[PDB]
């Protein structure tokens, strides 16, 4: 049959309807006693100009098409070259949109900081008026303004404590919950495995059919999936 080769497109878009394909064949080199790969670039006809640099293609022998062209593209085995072209165009649009959004979020942050620098009022001073007015009874209009600078309509000892909250405090509680879950899951499964009877019951209670007839790994995974379905789904 017609001689067919597999190769990588190494040049495209330089000649009209012609691409350069790199074909590698296996040969034996008697001198060094080693089976080597021999490489050759083929000028190949691309009637539809579909192939792109980087594509893996199969080329088939044809009639003479020019001084040096004797093969044509017969199939695109892998279209990595075509993918490269599509992803580059999308990237330009995708990145422009993201950069526009980030540029607007930077100017907004700058405006807020500039606005705050125009308000001579300071947190410490404001928190020293909400704690003196709340301990003296005075209600100068500054407080009403302070009830707008911060949004704190009510001036109580439990409102300054909520104006000065630090994110670290929230992190400290999320971390304790995370540690609890892991510790509970491990103790639960550890105990369950120690008692085969309580384990068999555990599985049946959660909806396993004849858990007794199961393997150690085929069933410990069920136990693990259940212990993690009784401490993460209920919570």
């Amino acid at each position: 049959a017609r001689q067919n080769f597999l190769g990588l497109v190494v040049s495209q878009g330089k000649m009209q309807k012609t691409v350069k394909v790199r074909v590698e064949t296996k040969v034996f080199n008697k001198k060094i006693n080693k089976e080597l790969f021999h490489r050759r670039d083929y000028l190949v006809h691309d009637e539809g100009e579909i192939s792109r640099e980087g594509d893996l293609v199969r080329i088939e022998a044809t009639r003479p098409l020019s001084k040096r062209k004797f093969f044509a593209i017969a199939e695109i085995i892998r279209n990595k070259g075509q993918q490269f072209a599509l992803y580059e165009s999308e990237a330009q649009l995708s990145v422009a949109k993201e950069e526009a959004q980030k540029a607007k979020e930077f100017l907004d942050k700058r405006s807020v900081r500039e606005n705050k620098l125009n308000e001579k009022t300071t947190l410490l001073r404001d928190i020293r008026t909400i704690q003196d007015a709340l301990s003296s009874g005075s209600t100068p209009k500054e407080l009403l303004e302070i009830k707008q600078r911060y949004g704190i309509q009510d001036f109580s000892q439990e409102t300054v404590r909520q104006l000065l909250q630090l994110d670290i405090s929230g992190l400290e509680v999320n971390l304790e919950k995370q540690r609890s879950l892991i510790d509970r899951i491990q103790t639960r499964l550890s105990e369950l495995l120690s008692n085969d009877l309580k384990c068999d019951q555990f599985l049946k209670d959660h909806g396993v059919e004849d858990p007794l007839t199961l393997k150690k790994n085929i069933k410990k995974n069920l136990l693990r999936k259940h212990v993690m379905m009784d401490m993460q789904q209920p919570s």
Binding site: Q157, E158, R161, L164, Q165, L166, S169
Partner: protein, 35 residues
């Protein structure tokens, strides 16, 4: 002592108990006990 310390140069325990309603929920607790 932590939050309930007498040192002039205290640690972050005191500031944490304040923002966690502990130095206040203990002051009331002690006072309620005194009552």
């Amino acid at each position: 002592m932590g939050s309930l310390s007498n040192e002039k140069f205290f640690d972050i325990s005191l500031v944490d108990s304040y923002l966690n309603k502990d130095l206040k929920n203990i002051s009331n607790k002690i006072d309620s006990k005194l009552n």
